[PDB]
PDB file of C-alpha atoms (C1' of nucleotides) in Angstrom:
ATOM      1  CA  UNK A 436      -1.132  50.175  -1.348  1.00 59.18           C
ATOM      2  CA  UNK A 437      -4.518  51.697  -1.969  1.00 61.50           C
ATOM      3  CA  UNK A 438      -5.895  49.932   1.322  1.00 62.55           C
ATOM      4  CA  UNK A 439      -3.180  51.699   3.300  1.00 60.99           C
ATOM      5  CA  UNK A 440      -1.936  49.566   4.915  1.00 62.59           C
ATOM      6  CA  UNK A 441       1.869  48.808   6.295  1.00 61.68           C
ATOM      7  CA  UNK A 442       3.392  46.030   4.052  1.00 61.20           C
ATOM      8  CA  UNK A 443       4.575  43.605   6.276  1.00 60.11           C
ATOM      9  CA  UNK A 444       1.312  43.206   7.850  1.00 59.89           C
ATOM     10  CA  UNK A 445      -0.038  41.733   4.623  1.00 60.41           C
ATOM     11  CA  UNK A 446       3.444  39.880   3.420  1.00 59.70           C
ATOM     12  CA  UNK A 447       3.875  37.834   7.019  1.00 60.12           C
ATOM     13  CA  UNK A 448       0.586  35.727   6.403  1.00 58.32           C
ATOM     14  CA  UNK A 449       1.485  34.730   2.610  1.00 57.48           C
ATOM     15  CA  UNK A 450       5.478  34.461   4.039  1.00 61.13           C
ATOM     16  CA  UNK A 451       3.888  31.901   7.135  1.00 62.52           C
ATOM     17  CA  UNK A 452       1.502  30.206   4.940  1.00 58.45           C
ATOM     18  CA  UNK A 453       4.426  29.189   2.048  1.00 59.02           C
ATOM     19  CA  UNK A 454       6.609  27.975   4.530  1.00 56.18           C
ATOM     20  CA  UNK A 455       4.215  25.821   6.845  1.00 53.95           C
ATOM     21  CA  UNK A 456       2.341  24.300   3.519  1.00 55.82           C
ATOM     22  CA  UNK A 457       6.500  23.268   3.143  1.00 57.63           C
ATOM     23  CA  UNK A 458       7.125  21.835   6.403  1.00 56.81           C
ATOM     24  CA  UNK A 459       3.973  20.012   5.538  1.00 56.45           C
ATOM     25  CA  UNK A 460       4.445  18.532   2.261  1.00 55.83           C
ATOM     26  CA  UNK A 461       8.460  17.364   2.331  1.00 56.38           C
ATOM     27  CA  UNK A 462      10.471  16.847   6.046  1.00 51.41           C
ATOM     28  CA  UNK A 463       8.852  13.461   6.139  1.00 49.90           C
ATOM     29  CA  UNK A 464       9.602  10.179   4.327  1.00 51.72           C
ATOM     30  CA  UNK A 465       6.584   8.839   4.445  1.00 48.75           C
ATOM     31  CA  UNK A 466       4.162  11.870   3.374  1.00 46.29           C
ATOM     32  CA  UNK A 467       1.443  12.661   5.564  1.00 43.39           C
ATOM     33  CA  UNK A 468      -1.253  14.688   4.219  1.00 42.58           C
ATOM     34  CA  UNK A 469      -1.751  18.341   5.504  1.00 43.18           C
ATOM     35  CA  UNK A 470      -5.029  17.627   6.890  1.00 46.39           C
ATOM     36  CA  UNK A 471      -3.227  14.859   9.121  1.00 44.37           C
ATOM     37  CA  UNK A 472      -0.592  16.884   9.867  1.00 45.81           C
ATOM     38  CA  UNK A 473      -3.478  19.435  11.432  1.00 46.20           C
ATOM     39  CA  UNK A 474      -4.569  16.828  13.397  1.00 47.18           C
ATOM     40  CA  UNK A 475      -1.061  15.670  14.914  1.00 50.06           C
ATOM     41  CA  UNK A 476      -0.477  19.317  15.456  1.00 50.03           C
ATOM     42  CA  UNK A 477      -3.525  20.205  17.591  1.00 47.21           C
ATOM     43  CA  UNK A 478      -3.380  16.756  19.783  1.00 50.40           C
ATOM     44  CA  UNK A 479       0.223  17.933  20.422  1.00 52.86           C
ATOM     45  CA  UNK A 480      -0.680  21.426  21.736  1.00 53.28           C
ATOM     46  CA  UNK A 481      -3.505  20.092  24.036  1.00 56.43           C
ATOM     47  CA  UNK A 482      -1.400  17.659  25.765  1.00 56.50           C
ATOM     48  CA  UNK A 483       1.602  19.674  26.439  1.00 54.95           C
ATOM     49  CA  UNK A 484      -1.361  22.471  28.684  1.00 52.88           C
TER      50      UNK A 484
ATOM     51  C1'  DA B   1     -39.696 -91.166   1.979  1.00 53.13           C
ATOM     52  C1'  DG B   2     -36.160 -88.851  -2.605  1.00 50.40           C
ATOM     53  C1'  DT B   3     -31.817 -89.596  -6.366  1.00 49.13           C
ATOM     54  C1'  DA B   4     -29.370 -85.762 -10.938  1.00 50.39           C
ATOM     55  C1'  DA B   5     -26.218 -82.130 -13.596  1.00 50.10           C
ATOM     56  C1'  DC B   6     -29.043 -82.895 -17.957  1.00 50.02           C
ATOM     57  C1'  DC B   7     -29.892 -78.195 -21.607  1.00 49.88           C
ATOM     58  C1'  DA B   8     -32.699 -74.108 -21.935  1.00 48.90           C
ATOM     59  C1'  DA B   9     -33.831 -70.630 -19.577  1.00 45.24           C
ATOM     60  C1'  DT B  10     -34.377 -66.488 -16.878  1.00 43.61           C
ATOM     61  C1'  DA B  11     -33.429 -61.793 -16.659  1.00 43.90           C
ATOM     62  C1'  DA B  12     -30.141 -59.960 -12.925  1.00 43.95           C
ATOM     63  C1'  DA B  13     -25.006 -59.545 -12.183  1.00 48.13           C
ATOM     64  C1'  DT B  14     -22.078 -55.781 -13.242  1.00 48.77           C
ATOM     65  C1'  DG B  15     -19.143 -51.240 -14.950  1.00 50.39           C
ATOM     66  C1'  DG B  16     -18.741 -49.210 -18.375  1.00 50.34           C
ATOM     67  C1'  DT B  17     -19.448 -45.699 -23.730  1.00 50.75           C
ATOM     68  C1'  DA B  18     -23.081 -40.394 -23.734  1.00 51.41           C
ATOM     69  C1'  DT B  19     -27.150 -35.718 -25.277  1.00 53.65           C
ATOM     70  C1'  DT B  20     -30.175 -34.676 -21.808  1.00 49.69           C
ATOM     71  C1'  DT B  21     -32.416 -32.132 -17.536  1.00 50.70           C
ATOM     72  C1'  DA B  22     -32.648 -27.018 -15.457  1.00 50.15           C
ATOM     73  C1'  DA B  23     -32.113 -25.649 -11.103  1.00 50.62           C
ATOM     74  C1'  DA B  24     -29.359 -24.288  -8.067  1.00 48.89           C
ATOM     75  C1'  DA B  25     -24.946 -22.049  -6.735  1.00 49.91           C
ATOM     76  C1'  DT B  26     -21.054 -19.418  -7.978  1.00 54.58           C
ATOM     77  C1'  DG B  27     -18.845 -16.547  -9.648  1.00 53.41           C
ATOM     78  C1'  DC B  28     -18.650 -12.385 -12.451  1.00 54.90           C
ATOM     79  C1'  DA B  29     -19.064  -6.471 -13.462  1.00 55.64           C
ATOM     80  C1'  DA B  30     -21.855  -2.529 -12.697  1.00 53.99           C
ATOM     81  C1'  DA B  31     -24.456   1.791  -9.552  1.00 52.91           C
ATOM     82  C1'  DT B  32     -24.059   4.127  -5.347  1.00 52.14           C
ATOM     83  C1'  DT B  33     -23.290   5.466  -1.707  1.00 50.29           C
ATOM     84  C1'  DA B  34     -19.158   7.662   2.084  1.00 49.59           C
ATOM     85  C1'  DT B  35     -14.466  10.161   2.970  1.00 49.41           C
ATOM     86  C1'  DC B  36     -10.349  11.352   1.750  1.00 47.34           C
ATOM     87  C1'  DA B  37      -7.068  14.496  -0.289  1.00 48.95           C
ATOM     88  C1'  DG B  38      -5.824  19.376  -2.393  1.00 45.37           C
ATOM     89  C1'  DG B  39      -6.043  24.551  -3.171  1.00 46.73           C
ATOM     90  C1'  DC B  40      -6.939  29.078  -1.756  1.00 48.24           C
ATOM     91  C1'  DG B  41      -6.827  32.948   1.690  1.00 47.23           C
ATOM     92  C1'  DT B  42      -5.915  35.648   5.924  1.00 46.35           C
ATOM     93  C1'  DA B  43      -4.626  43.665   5.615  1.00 43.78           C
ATOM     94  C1'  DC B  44      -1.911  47.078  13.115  1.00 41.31           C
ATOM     95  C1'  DC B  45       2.862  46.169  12.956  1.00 42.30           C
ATOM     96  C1'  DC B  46       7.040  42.971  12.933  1.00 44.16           C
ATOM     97  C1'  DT B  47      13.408  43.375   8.618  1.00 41.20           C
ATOM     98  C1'  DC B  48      21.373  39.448   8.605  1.00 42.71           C
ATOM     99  C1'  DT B  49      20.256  36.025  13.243  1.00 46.71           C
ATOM    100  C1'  DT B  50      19.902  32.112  13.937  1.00 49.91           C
ATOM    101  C1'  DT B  51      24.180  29.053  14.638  1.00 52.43           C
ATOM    102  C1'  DG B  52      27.899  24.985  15.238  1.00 51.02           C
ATOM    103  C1'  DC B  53      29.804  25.627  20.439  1.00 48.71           C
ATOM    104  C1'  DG B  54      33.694  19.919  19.599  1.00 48.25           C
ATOM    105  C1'  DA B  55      32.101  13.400  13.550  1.00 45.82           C
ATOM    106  C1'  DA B  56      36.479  17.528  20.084  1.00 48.47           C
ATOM    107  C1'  DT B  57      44.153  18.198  24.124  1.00 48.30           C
ATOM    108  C1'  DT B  58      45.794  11.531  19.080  1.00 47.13           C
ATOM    109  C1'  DC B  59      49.826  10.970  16.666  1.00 43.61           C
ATOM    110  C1'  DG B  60      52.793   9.861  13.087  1.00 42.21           C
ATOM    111  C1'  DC B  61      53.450  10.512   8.272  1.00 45.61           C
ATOM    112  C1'  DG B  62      53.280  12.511   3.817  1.00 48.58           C
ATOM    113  C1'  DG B  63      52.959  16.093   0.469  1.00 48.99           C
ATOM    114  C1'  DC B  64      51.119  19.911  -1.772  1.00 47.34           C
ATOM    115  C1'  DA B  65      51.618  23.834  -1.072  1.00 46.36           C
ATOM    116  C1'  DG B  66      53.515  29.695  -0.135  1.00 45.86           C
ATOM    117  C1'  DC B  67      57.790  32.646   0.684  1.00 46.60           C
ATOM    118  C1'  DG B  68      63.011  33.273  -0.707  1.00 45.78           C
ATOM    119  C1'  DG B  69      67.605  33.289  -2.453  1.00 44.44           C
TER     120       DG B  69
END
DNA sequence: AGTAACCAATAAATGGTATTTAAAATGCAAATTATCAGGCGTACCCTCTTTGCGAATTCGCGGCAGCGG
């Protein structure tokens, strides 16, 4: 609290983090790495735009 | 334009028994580079809200249930 700030501000990031590192790691049978997952992720969001 | 198979002889006929030759080649296990795979962190503020909508008008049957003398 000494840096003043609201709470939620700082707990969102670790709370976002935790649960994408998840989605990462199990939801898949076959486990792609993160880094891979990255990848996949960005080449989706260009060729949607 | 000349008979011999006489008895020695000659080594050439083989395909078989091995310790060699070292060169090669062929494999073998290191060093030594690339790249992949994990972990951490992020400070304006954000606070039950999304769902399933229906393994979808079945039906017939059974029976284990709650109310009731």
């Amino acid at each position: 609290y000494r840096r003043g700030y609201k709470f939620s501000t700082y707990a969102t990031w670790w709370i976002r983090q935790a649960i994408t590192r998840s989605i990462a790691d199990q939801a898949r049978t076959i486990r792609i790495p993160v880094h891979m997952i990255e990848t996949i992720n960005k080449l989706n969001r260009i060729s949607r735009q």
